[PDB]
Amino acid sequence: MFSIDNILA
Amino acid sequence: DYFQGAMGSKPAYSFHVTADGQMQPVPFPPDALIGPGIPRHARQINTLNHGEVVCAVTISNPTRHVYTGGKGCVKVWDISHPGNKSPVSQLDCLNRDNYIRSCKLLPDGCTLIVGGEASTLSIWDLAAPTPRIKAELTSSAPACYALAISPDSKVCFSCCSDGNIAVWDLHNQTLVRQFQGHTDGASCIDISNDGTKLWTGGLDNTVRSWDLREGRQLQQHDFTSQIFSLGYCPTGEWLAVGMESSNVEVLHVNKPDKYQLHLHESCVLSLKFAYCGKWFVSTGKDNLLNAWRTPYGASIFQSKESSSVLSCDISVDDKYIVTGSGDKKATVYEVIY
Amino acid sequence: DYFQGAMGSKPAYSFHVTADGQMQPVPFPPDALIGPGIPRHARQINTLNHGEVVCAVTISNPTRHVYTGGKGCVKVWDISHPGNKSPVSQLDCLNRDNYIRSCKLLPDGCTLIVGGEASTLSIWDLAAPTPRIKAELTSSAPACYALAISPDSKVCFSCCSDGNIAVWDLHNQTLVRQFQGHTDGASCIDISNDGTKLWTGGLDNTVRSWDLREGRQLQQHDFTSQIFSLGYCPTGEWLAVGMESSNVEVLHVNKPDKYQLHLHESCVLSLKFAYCGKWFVSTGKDNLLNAWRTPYGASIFQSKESSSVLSCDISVDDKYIVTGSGDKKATVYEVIY
């Protein structure tokens, strides 16, 4: 599971 | 010409992988890098200053508006008025702190479906004034990561963060089917060119094909890393898959061989086939938009942006490419033939 | 090591000038940058550390030895090994302080004619198997800038610093004729593919053609800057000219059109056609080796070296390119098809 914050930071 | 071709070269980046483990650098045919319907280059023509990371982008048909999904809202930009510096509309979709992850226009351009980091998909009427919310689909999955519309416009497919694929009857707003299989989030999705099969990629390292009539999983491809993006060639035969590993894998549909393409240094976050199917683009966390020949992946052009490229779209006539940026903007490119 | 092409794009750099004044960017045909006999990559495989600026280079036929002309010394290198990297012999000139400007082999590969910034042409026996100086041909001009050997090997043409082309009978070791006309040093020279016409470039801003039998001047072309290099296409029809500005011009022989090509930022020091005639290279004070499609000059590759590139040769088999450098070395490139 990936949120955009995970993907970016 | 105005711009002219100039040939470059790299250490071999494109490989054919046969049924066994065997990996051969692709010898490019004469029309790999040049030919009818093959771009010569891409020219940046607009920057759309959303002001939040653009996780989703789509372009209208006819091309005149672009939709950028950021944090809580979709902004609508009129690119047929090149001087505009701000949106013409804003669609308030989710909580201001939740990212939009996908936005899809219905084939006729009257309706936009939006999903992201929330339980609700919003359906927007785009017939004037004043784009307005027409309906909501409420799932019990925490988030939507990707959407696809059936070619007849009747159904919306939503890739859920729990790995399920929700099938929504749009007319009556009812979840009519759920494809169960993915054991982590379903991250991407496309439909086969004959419209009979669904193809999905997952954070469980699989690609799965599904029969749309019967509802059953048909194939499974297990990889060594997570899948972030995928695209089905509109003329058939080939599925491109963007990997967390930085590879693009071009799978020969039903067959044991594939192409492995290595021109990213990080995760491949998005990909999209041109409508003619003869080429596609991939985008990376490494800031690159790569254009690739179908199927074997000769590198047609590369554009290096200022930040991670999270999302992309190509217009219906293959004339424009839009990309969404970690630098809180979208870029419009014109494809020059 | 395998390499693959990757297409790129530049602002228009290749222009066609027709018989009327008209100047238009070239629309490249589909085989401009791609095809049988067109390089896809130039791989640097050897550095030859001469230790003086390398102002002349030549390669044996068959490909085996490279000759590098420096200051008061020609070194001989054996490239049948990579890799390697050390000279196998050296030819020490009368006074060791004058730059060598040109060296050329007779077809049998055991005679080398050497000329440069002294009033003497040297004939070296390389039978041998260790080199011996066979004759010294003395001129009253202080320097030779370039040499050409007649296709029948009987005659050496020397471009003198005074503008004269001296014709030497090699077997008898004797000055037989002078082509007079250039009103400043002749810097470069080639023979037409039929063997009947001499072409020379000058620091008087002209290119001249000469009847090798009649003995005198046929055509003249007047230019805006000094001429530093030229080559005649081995398959006929085209004459490439390298200029003090930075332009490469490709003149249509006996016809009134030309191409003008702009990818150098400085003087075009040297130039050489592939023996198949389908492409050629130029080298620049700007450190570039540029490869160009015949005649219209689509950019096949560019290689940026550490320093000024003063000289080049391409092997008779089109497999190798050798460049001479202001960094006191030569570079051997393997041409990858």
Curated annotation (Swiss-Prot), chains B, C:
The lineage of its organism: Eukaryota, Metazoa, Chordata, Craniata, Vertebrata. Homooligomer and heterooligomer with other family members. Binds RUNX1, RUNX3, FOXA2, KDM6A, UTY, histone H3, HESX1, ESRRG and the NF-kappa-B subunit RELA. Interacts with HES1 (via WRPW motif). Binds TCF7, LEF1, TCF7L1 and TCF7L2. Interacts with SIX3. Interacts with EFNB1. Interacts with TLE4. Interacts with FOXG1/BF-1; the interaction is inhibited by TLE6/GRG6. Changing residue 282 to P: Abolishes HESX1 binding. The chain holds residues 443 to 770 of 770 of the full protein. Phosphorylated, probably by CDK1. The degree of phosphorylation varies throughout the cell cycle, and is highest at the G2/M transition. Becomes hyperphosphorylated in response to cell differentiation and interaction with HES1 or RUNX1. WD repeat Groucho/TLE family members are characterized by 5 regions, a glutamine-rich Q domain, a glycine/proline-rich GP domain, a central CcN domain, containing a nuclear localization signal, and a serine/proline-rich SP domain. The most highly conserved are the N-terminal Q domain and the C-terminal WD-repeat domain. WD repeats lie at residues 37-68, 95-125, 139-169, 181-211, 263-293, 304-334. Belongs to the WD repeat Groucho/TLE family. Changing residue 99 to H: Abolishes HESX1 binding. It is found in: Nucleus. Changing residue 269 to S: Abolishes HESX1 binding. In all tissues examined, mostly in brain, liver and muscle. This is Transducin-like enhancer protein 1. Transcriptional corepressor that binds to a number of transcription factors. Inhibits NF-kappa-B-regulated gene expression. Inhibits the transcriptional activation mediated by FOXA2, and by CTNNB1 and TCF family members in Wnt signaling. Enhances FOXG1/BF-1- and HES1-mediated transcriptional repression. The effects of full-length TLE family members may be modulated by association with dominant-negative AES. Unusual function as coactivator for ESRRG.
